[PDB]
């Protein structure tokens, strides 16, 4: 359900910024699609941030992600579950080492480092 953006087309008029943003949006939507099928989870909204990769450490910016969740009306995620989710997200996008992803919930309890 994410692949609509990719498998459509864009008329002479979408510039490079817009192209990159739309590709990132496809990433977000398809990752949310992957997370919906989780048995515990009911809804997830994912935001991204692409890196820069400059050798000069003082100039590097490094990749980032932020995944917000709304699980069932009950249940609370055990840390194994949140680690599996964050590992899936971290491997999904190029870069963004597994500690550069923030995970939250409906009640607002922090679930990962940022």
């Amino acid at each position: 359900a994410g692949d609509d953006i990719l498998l459509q087309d864009m008329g002479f008029g979408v510039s490079q910024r817009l192209e990159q943003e739309r590709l990132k949006l496809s990433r977000e939507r398809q990752l949310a699609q992957a997370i919906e099928e989780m048995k515990q989870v009911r809804k997830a909204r994912v935001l991204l941030a692409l890196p820069k990769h400059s050798v000069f450490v003082r100039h590097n910016q490094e990749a980032s992600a932020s995944v917000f969740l709304t699980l069932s009306t009950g249940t609370n995620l055990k840390q194994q579950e949140v680690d599996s989710i964050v590992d899936m997200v971290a491997s999904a996008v190029p870069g963004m080492k597994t500690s550069r992803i923030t995970v939250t919930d409906q009640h607002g309890r922090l679930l990962s480092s940022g």
């Binding site: 400059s54 050798v55 000069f56 450490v57 100039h59």
Partner: protein
């Protein structure tokens, strides 16, 4: 440890031989030279400002824009050196730092990144790269920056050429060359805008 007097003279006399190279590679001479060439190409005249005059203005301007660097070289390096407060080793290193700082400020990260990976050295921060990896990167960025400034100046003269060409074509004369007709207006645009003061001030201000 400290170099002998005979060796200090030999090193100093060596740098005078490479003085033309340092002007066109390690200073503002190249960017100013390129911009005037593009600006001259934009106008209809191809050899009216004359190469000697353009280089002469470039030499005067590069003396004005490198004065903060030269004064720092004088204060940090020469004055301790002439007063025997630092050795010949320290004086040369103290002279190199302000020159390296000037080139680092006008360079581009990607250009630095390109040559660092090419040189095969382990660099943690840009502000400590070797001189041999900075000079090719600095001149590369200056050439790219010169092209961007040249494109800015080329557009107003291009618009005049396009405007006059279409007006002549509207009246049905498809054999009259627009270049001859456009030339007086190209010159006037550079005059009432005070181009020779506006362009040089921007070029000098482009290093601040």
């Amino acid at each position: 440890e400290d170099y002998s007097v005979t060796l200090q003279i030999l090193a100093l006399m060596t740098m005078l031989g490479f003085l033309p190279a340092m002007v066109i590679l390690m200073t503002s001479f190249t960017r100013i030279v390129v911009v005037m060439s593009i600006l001259r190409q934009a106008m209809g005249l191809q050899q009216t400002p004359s190469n000697q005059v353009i280089i002469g203005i470039a030499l005067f301007l590069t003396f004005f824009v490198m004065s903060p660097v030269l004064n720092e070289i004088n204060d940090k390096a020469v004055q301790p050196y002439l007063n025997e407060q630092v050795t010949a080793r320290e004086a040369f290193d103290a002279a190199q730092a302000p020159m390296k700082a000037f080139m680092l400020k006008q360079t581009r990260i990607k250009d630095l990144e390109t040559f660092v990976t090419m040189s095969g050295e382990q660099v943690d921060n840009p502000e400590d790269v070797s001189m041999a990896v900075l000079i090719p990167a600095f001149i590369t960025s200056e050439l790219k920056t010169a092209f961007q400034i040249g494109f800015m100046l080329f557009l107003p003269f291009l618009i005049i050429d396009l405007v006059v060409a279409s007006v002549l074509m509207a009246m049905g004369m498809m054999m009259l060359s627009p270049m001859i007709v456009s030339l007086p207006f190209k010159l006037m645009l550079f005059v009432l805008v005070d181009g020779w003061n506006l362009i040089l001030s921007t070029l000098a201000g482009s290093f601040a």
